[PDB]
Amino acid sequence: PGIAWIALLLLVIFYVFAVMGTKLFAQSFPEWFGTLGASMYTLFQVMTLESWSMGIARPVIEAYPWAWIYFVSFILVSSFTVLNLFIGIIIESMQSAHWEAEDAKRIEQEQRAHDERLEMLQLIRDLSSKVDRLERRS
Amino acid sequence: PGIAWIALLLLVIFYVFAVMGTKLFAQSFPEWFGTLGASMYTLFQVMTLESWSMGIARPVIEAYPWAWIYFVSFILVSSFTVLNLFIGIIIESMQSAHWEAEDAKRIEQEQRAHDERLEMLQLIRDLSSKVDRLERRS
Amino acid sequence: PGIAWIALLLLVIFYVFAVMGTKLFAQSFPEWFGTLGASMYTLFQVMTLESWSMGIARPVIEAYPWAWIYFVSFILVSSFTVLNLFIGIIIESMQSAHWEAEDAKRIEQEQRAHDERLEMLQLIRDLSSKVDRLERRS
Amino acid sequence: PGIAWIALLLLVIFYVFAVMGTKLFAQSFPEWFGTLGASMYTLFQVMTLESWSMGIARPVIEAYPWAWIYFVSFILVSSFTVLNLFIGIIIESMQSAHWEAEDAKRIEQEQRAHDERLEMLQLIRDLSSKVDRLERRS
Ligand SMILES: [Ca+2]
Ligand SMILES: [Ca+2]
Ligand SMILES: [Ca+2]
Ligand SMILES: [Ca+2]
Ligand SMILES: [Ca+2]
Ligand SMILES: [Ca+2]
Ligand SMILES: [Ca+2]
Numbered sequence: 290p291g292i293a294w295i296a297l298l299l300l301v302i303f304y305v306f307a308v309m310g311t312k313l314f315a316q317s318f319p320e321w322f323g324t325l326g327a328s329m330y331t332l333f334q335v336m337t338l339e340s341w342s343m344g345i346a347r348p349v350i351e352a353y354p355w356a357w358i359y360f361v362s363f364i365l366v367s368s369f370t371v372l373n374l375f376i377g378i379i380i381e382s383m384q385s386a387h388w389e390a391e392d393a394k395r396i397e398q399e400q401r402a403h404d405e406r407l408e409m410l411q412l413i414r415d416l417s418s419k420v421d422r423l424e425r426r427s
Numbered sequence: 428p429g430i431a432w433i434a435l436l437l438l439v440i441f442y443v444f445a446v447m448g449t450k451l452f453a454q455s456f457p458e459w460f461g462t463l464g465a466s467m468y469t470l471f472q473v474m475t476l477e478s479w480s481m482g483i484a485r486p487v488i489e490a491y492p493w494a495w496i497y498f499v500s501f502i503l504v505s506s507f508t509v510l511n512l513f514i515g516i517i518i519e520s521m522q523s524a525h526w527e528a529e530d531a532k533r534i535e536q537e538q539r540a541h542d543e544r545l546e547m548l549q550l551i552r553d554l555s556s557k558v559d560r561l562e563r564r565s
Numbered sequence: 566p567g568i569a570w571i572a573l574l575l576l577v578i579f580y581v582f583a584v585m586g587t588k589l590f591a592q593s594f595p596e597w598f599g600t601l602g603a604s605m606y607t608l609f610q611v612m613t614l615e616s617w618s619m620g621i622a623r624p625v626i627e628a629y630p631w632a633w634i635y636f637v638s639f640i641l642v643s644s645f646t647v648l649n650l651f652i653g654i655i656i657e658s659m660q661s662a663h664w665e666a667e668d669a670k671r672i673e674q675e676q677r678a679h680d681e682r683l684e685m686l687q688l689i690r691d692l693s694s695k696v697d698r699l700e701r702r703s
Numbered sequence: 704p705g706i707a708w709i710a711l712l713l714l715v716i717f718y719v720f721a722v723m724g725t726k727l728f729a730q731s732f733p734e735w736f737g738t739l740g741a742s743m744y745t746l747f748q749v750m751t752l753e754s755w756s757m758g759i760a761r762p763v764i765e766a767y768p769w770a771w772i773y774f775v776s777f778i779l780v781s782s783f784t785v786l787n788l789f790i791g792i793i794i795e796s797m798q799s800a801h802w803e804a805e806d807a808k809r810i811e812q813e814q815r816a817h818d819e820r821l822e823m824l825q826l827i828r829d830l831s832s833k834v835d836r837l838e839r840r841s
Contacts, residue, residue, distance in 0.1 A: 330771060333775065334756045334761075337752050337755070337778070338475050338752065339477070339752050339753075339754065339755055339757060340756075340757040341472075341475065341477045342468075342472040342475075342477055342478075343472075343477060343478040343482050344757050346472075357468060361468075361471060372513070372516070375786065376516060376517060376520055378786065379517055379790060380520060380521055380524055380525075382790055382794055383521055383525075383790075383793065383794055383797060383798070384521070384524065384525035386798070387797075387798035387802055387806075388525045388798075391802075391806060392525075392529070395533070395809070398813050399533075402540075402817070403539075403540065405817070405824075406540065406543045406544070406547065406820075407543070409820065409823070409824055409827065410543070410547050410550070412827050412828070412831070413547065413550050413551060413554065413827060415831070416554060416827070416830065417550065417553070417554055417557070419838065420554060420557045420834060421557060422838070423561070423837065423841060424557060424560065424561065426838075426841055427561060427564060427841065476613050476614070477615070478615065479613065479615050480610045480613070480615050480616065481615065481616040481620045482616075495606055499606070502613070510651065510654065514654060514658055517655055518655075518659055518662055521659060522659065522662065522663040526663050533671070537671070541678070541681070544681050544682070544685070545681070548681070548685050548688070551685065551689060552688065554692065555688065555692055555695075558692060558695055558696060558699075561699070562698065562699065562702065565699065565702055565703070614751050614752070614753050616753065616754065617748075617751070617753045618744075618748040618751075618754070619748070619753060619758045620754075622748075637744075637747060640751070648789065648792070652793055652796055656793075656800055656801075659797060659801075660800065660801035660802075664801045664805075668801075668805070671809075672808075675812045678816075679815070679816065679819070682816060682819045682820070683819065685823070686819070686822075686826070689823060689827065689830070690826065692830060693826060693829070693830055693833075696830060696833050696834060697833060699833075699837065700833060700836060700837070700840075703837060703840050703841075
């Protein structure tokens with residue numbers, strides 16, 4: 290398993306949508322969608338929210354007015370799995386730098402005293418056997 | 428309740444302002460605010476700050492010179508209830524993955540020794556009952 | 566007293582800079598820096614990094630070629646005292662929604678047994694006198 | 704060394720890349736890469752994703768087709784070694800306003816009852832040497 294597991298999913302979405310868009314727009318916007326290789330570029334350009342609608346979406350949507358859905362969704366999904374991936378890094382850093390190291394520094398402190406108690410206990414019971422061996426001796 | 432509760436709120440702010448925009452600018456920016464759906468689009472774009480100002484705000488502000496307040500507010504609000512949503516996940520995931528788990532492991536490893544303590548205590552007053560039972564017997 | 570103290574500071578930076586730019590560029594970029602309240606806009610737009618350079622800076626810098634330091638520094642400072650403020654919310658949220666109620670659950674779980682151990686102690690000294698009065702009573 | 708150590712790294716990449724693009728695009732794109740401190744600029748602008756591609760890269764890629772790798776990877780690398788640094792601020796901020804304080808108040812609270820325990824044991828042992836000097840007396 291892993292984080293670099295969404296970066297697979299994401300790089301899947303990235304490919305999924307790239308070809309999806311070559312299929313539609315390569316037709317009429319052959320500089321943006323003319324090949325797969327430009328889609329990849331344009332889709333990275335588009336993920337980076339740089340003249341995404343004004344530049345690309347609008348004039349495409351100019352053509353295929355439903356294209357909006359294609360652009361909007363892509364952005365939603367794309368950026369959103371980066372949020373899930375940006376988070377994956379916050380977590381697997383924020384419960385790694387401190388929380389995996391204390392995670393065991395108090396897993397160790399705590400069992401370093403069920404060790405003191407359970408000996409102290411054993412000590413008081415060799416007291417009870419020494420005392421209760423002197424109501425059986427008085 | 429929930430954090431998919433601000434996703435309701437946001438998706439109202441978004442519809443509020445969409446109808447606000449359409450009612451206003453539909454008139455003279457009918458490309459952007461021509462329909463409710465048109466503004467729903469524009470405002471996604473404005474939210475993604477992609478030629479948001481140079482593209483939409485400023486030209487809407489030339490015509491309607493107070494629209495800045497509209498646009499700057501919508502941005503401030505919308506984006507702000509995403510910061511309020513983006514953290515709604517770093518929290519609900521950073522204290523759900525590390526700190527829901529330990530929350531019970533140290534809730535446990537503490538109440539596991541009110542066990543050892545309160546029983547070992549008992550052992551001592553059973554010893555105190557056996558010894559004080561032998562100054563009243565010596 | 567709080568996080569809104571940078572909000573103040575950042576609302577300072579915003580004001581200082583909006584005047585400095587009015588005094589400089591009002592002159593030749595009046596639409597952007599003509600009034601105070603339009604440098605306020607323009608620097609809201611600069612802060613949002615929307616056509617920031619290619620739309621404002623490049624042009625201002627065509628004219629005044631040291632204005633770069635102005636823009637860059639503003640951006641740096643601005644988005645930095647925001648990174649500073651953005652975090653002053655993850656922090657003031659992640660040790661407030663979890664690390665505040667535990668912070669008192671196990672400052673209280675702790676002091677619930679300096680109050681057991683320290684009763685258990687006496688009860689053991691009360692066994693040390695009643696026994697130490699039996700090497701002298703034997 | 705730490706957060707400010709990737710600021711060295713980032714400030715490395717930034718430099719690396721600037722001279723590269725000056726040794727490359729200084730020729731044909733001299734507004735952006737004519738000099739060093741124009742690549743330094745353009746690169747800042749390119750980093751902040753302001754017209755990075757439609758403005759710079761796409762036209763640079765109009766000259767040199769492979770130039771794409773140059774801008775993509777700068778963004779990938781650059782923006783990435785800030786995710787790395789941004790996060791190095793939530794971390795070295797998160798477990799530092801709440802967790803460099805508790806990790807010592809709980810290094811302490813634990814150490815104050817190795818001290819309670821330890822003295823209690825001794826108290827039990829001296830209780831034992833007293834009892835065990837009373838099998839041998841009775
Ligand atoms: Ca533009
Ligand atoms: Ca149009
Ligand atoms: Ca904790
Ligand atoms: Ca005007
Ligand atoms: Ca020029
Ligand atoms: Ca050209
Ligand atoms: Ca404890």
